[PDB]
Design a protein around this ligand. Structure first.
Ligand SMILES: *[C@@H]1O[C@H](CO)[C@@H](O[C@@H]2O[C@H](CO)[C@@H](O[C@@H]3O[C@H](CO[C@H]4O[C@H](CO)[C@@H](O)[C@H](O)[C@@H]4O)[C@@H](O)[C@H](O[C@H]4O[C@H](CO)[C@@H](O)[C@H](O)[C@@H]4O[C@H]4O[C@H](CO)[C@@H](O)[C@H](O)[C@@H]4O)[C@@H]3O)[C@H](O)[C@H]2NC(C)=O)[C@H](O)[C@H]1NC(C)=O
Ligand SMILES: *[C@@H]1O[C@H](CO)[C@@H](O[C@@H]2O[C@H](CO)[C@@H](O)[C@H](O)[C@H]2NC(C)=O)[C@H](O)[C@H]1NC(C)=O
Ligand SMILES: *[C@@H]1O[C@H](CO)[C@@H](O[C@@H]2O[C@H](CO)[C@@H](O)[C@H](O)[C@H]2NC(C)=O)[C@H](O)[C@H]1NC(C)=O
Ligand SMILES: *[C@@H]1O[C@H](CO)[C@@H](O[C@@H]2O[C@H](CO)[C@@H](O)[C@H](O)[C@H]2NC(C)=O)[C@H](O)[C@H]1NC(C)=O
Ligand SMILES: *[C@@H]1O[C@H](CO)[C@@H](O[C@@H]2O[C@H](CO)[C@@H](O)[C@H](O)[C@H]2NC(C)=O)[C@H](O)[C@H]1NC(C)=O
Ligand SMILES: *[C@@H]1O[C@H](CO)[C@@H](O)[C@H](O)[C@H]1NC(C)=O
Ligand SMILES: *[C@@H]1O[C@H](CO)[C@@H](O)[C@H](O)[C@H]1NC(C)=O
Ligand SMILES: CCOCCOCCOCCO
Ligand SMILES: O=C(O)c1cc(O)c(O)c(O)c1
Ligand SMILES: [Ca+2]
Ligand SMILES: [Cl-]
Ligand SMILES: [Cl-]
Ligand code: NA
Ligand SMILES: [Zn+2]
Ligand SMILES: [Zn+2]
Ligand SMILES: [Zn+2]
Ligand SMILES: [Zn+2]
Length: 554
């Protein structure tokens, strides 16, 4: 009875008959008549997140609605492998920025491993419409449905509906195991944690890159560089900060034991390199289309701004509120803009930081027009007030993962060492929060080993924000996480190191391994053999006491 070819599977009749019924989730009505099906043959796909492949699938869409919400409509898109290629897998995929889906970019990474692969539009009025465009009913009035669907509810619904459709359409019996996975990065990484924190058996394995969790701290810290520039009254030309990054890479490359223009030890960099040594170094950048030529020498004021940004937000009493990007991360938040009238570089308000304040604090826009009157203490107050307001929805830092752990779930979490958008230390902090909450009566090594049985964290040498870094093109990137997670969950293969691949430059295609936290990489034998070493001084450099904040910040 069950279809045997892609052509037999990919029809409106087959998919409509496999949908779960309306009220299978009480409050959800599924619109059977909305089903679309389309065969896609010989699609060539590629990504930094999965190996290159050619895939065939059934592209399915359909709509559902929440009972009692006038005008409500949610769209799902699910790609179904051919029946001969289906391997009893489900893959949920997620978003980026204020989007809850990644269009056609994540779904291939499931289909090529024989997974039914899904995404949602979140109820936002189409896949290409995002949560920020749907967040406000009026100026001052949040759409709470949008907030909750973006926070966690849309992904819960996608998994429940998609897993049921996948079991029905392939003729799985109730005893047949469906291995269910998530794969996403950035806002997508936050979306993975949103489900792992609440729903213990939604997924068997979650693959999470550089998550935009710890919402109130992560979004507000995007304004920190802007406020440093205002407070010290100096707007560095982008080229001056780019020179500091280039000289930090030059000074810290060899601290990992391998001379490759990759800083694998941003911890040793932060501990041992003083950027004051860069004062007086010349810089020159060519004129762009929209920016003029920059040249000069690295200034004392430029170094003071850079050191202040790297040191992280501290309040008016010198108490630490948060942490910032690692050394070698680009100074994106600090980006200034050139004024032709005045001939001077000036404030350029960070878009992501401004959007958080305008959309979710002020609830009346997506852009902040001014930082007049905004101090370090204003940023602290936003981080603390937002923690209370968004704890239950966007914060996504709940550290008690007892249900997920007890269901036997696994996590692979990764983060670029040179991430300029989300501080690398943000990921270490959450793993340590989970460790201390779930294993409270054990010493560091014993609790770390217990957590490392099921939730492993890896930093990526030289990598940017969920991507390779053109400044450090010899750096590796974990392109094979779905295969590694399948091997862990389905085959018992524990990822002692995380598999990685050099994707760019003269070493393109070469293999590398990534050390699992709290070990760090160190190369021996003239850069030829990599070890994963325990170094207390380095481990301590990743740990921060947020003594400005009375509440625990997980
Ligand atoms: C997986 O499968 C999904 C589902 O099929 C697929 O997503 C769909 O993609 C198609 C193509 O991009 C989308 O189709 C467009 O839909 C818009 C909106 O259509 C609806 O609403 C309109 C009114 O707004 C109704 O009239 C209509 O019946 C639908 O209700 C259409 O407006 C688009 O048509 C215009 O552009 C086309 C170019 O692609 C032209 O070929 C077409 O003739 C239309 O042009 C002009 O029409 C008018 C001229 O008088 C005028 O309004 C403008 O000048 C306009 O240019 C087009 O049909 C569809 O919405 C997607 N559906 C969903 C749910 O997302 C995925 O792409 C697929 N993925 C893969 C990888 O296979
Ligand atoms: C999809 O790709 C497959 C594999 O390249 C194509 O099938 C091949 O077509 C050539 C030419 O007819 C045959 O000699 C081979 O025997 C086919 N290989 C297989 C494995 O069947 C197929 O034509 C392509 N389809 C489309 C729509 O482009
Ligand atoms: C968007 O909302 C914010 C907060 O509701 C408004 O900010 C206030 O503006 C008035 C003067 O216009 C000040 O006296 C208040 O101190 C501000 N409050 C805060 C908390 O900043 C802002 O005007 C609103 N913008 C628009 C365009 O309506
Ligand atoms: C900082 O380093 C980067 C390289 O990592 C420099 O960018 C390269 O510079 C050359 C000459 O200008 C260009 O042809 C390349 O296209 C650039 N590479 C990349 C990846 O963009 C950059 O100019 C250096 N900046 C400073 C201020 O010295
Ligand atoms: C915690 O565990 C680590 C191992 O993961 C211990 O690190 C080792 O320490 C010994 C003795 O100093 C060294 O000979 C090894 O080379 C270290 N191993 C690695 C992989 O670097 C560490 O000492 C333990 N901490 C405590 C307090 O016992
Ligand atoms: C909201 O306020 C903005 C800023 O003044 C105004 O441009 C806009 O029309 C108002 N309403 C909405 C919901 O857009
Ligand atoms: C540049 O400065 C002049 C005043 O000196 C101002 O009128 C102009 O708007 C400024 N440009 C921008 C984009 O701020
Ligand atoms: C095709 C390359 O295979 C490399 C090793 O893959 C490991 C197995 O993972 C599970 C995927 O089916
Ligand atoms: O998805 C992203 O790229 C993204 C989302 C965020 O909310 C964010 O603060 C950020 O720095 C990156
Ligand atoms: Ca190196
Ligand atoms: Cl199931
Ligand atoms: Cl991944
Ligand atoms: Na069809
Ligand atoms: Zn098509
Ligand atoms: Zn079966
Ligand atoms: Zn346990
Ligand atoms: Zn153990």
């Amino acid at each position: 009875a069950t279809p045997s070819t892609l052509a037999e599977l990919c029809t409106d009749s087959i998919v409509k008959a496999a949908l779960p019924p309306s009220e299978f989730i009480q409050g959800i009505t599924i619109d059977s008549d909305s089903v679309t099906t389309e065969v896609v043959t010989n699609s060539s796909v590629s990504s930094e997140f999965y190996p290159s492949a050619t895939i065939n699938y059934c592209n399915v869409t359909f709509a559902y609605s929440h009972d009692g919400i006038d005008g409500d409509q949610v769209l799902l898109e699910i790609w179904l492998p051919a029946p001969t290629d289906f391997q009893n897998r489900w893959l949920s995929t997620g978003g980026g920025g204020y989007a809850i889906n990644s269009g056609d970019q994540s779904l291939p990474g499931g289909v090529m491993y024989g997974a039914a692969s899904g995404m949602t539009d979140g109820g936002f009025g189409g896949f290409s419409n995002n949560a920020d465009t749907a967040m406000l009913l009026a100026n001052g009035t949040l759409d709470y449905e949008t907030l909750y669907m973006f926070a966690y509810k849309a992904h819960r619904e996608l998994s429940l509906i998609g897993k049921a459709l996948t079991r029905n359409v392939y003729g799985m019996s109730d005893s047949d195991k469906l291995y269910a996975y998530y794969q996403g990065c950035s806002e997508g990484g936050r979306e993975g944690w949103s489900q792992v924190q609440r729903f213990g058996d939604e997924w068997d394995g979650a693959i999470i890159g550089a998550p935009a969790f710890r919402w109130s701290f992560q979004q507000t810290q995007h304004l920190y560089s802007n406020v440093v520039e205002k407070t010290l009254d100096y707007y560095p030309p982008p080229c001056e900060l780019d020179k500091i990054v280039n000289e930090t890479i030059a000074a810290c490359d060899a601290m990992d034991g391998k001379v490759d223009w990759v800083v694998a030890r941003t911890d040793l960099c932060l501990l041992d390199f003083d950027i004051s040594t860069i004062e007086g170094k010349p810089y020159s950048c060519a004129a762009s289309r929209g920016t003029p030529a920059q040249n000069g020498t690295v200034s004392a004021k430029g170094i003071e701004v850079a050191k202040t940004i790297i040191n992280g937000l501290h309040d008016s009493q010198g108490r630490r509120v948060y942490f910032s990007y690692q050394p070698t991360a680009a100074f994106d938040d600090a980006e200034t803009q050139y004024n032709s009238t005045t001939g001077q570089w000036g404030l350029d308000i960070d878009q992501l930081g401004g959007e958080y304040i305008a959309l979710l604090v002020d609830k009346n826009g997506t852009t902040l027009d001014s930082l007049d009157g905004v101090t370090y203490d204003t940023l602290k107050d936003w981080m603390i007030s937002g923690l209370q307001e968004y704890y239950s929805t966007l914060q996504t830092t709940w550290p008690d993962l007892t249900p997920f752990h007890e269901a036997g779930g696994k996590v692979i979490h990764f983060h670029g060492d040179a991430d300029f958008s989300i501080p690398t230390a943000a990921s270490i902090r959450y793993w340590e929060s989970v460790r201390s909450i779930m294993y409270p009566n054990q010493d560091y090594n014993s609790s770390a080993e217990a957590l490392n049985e099921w939730y492993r964290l890896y930093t990526v040498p030289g990598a940017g924000h969920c991507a390779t870094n053109d400044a450090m093109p010899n750096g590796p990137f974990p392109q094979t996480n779905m295969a590694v997670m399948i091997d862990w969950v389905e085959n018992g293969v524990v990822p002692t190191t995380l598999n990685a691949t050099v994707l760019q430059g003269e070493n393109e295609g070469q293999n590398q391994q990534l050390c699992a936290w709290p070990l760090r990489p160190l190369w021996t034998n003239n850069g030829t053999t990599m070890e994963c070493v325990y170094n207390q001084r380095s481990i301590d450099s990743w740990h921060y006491d947020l003594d400005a904040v009375p509440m625990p910040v997980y």
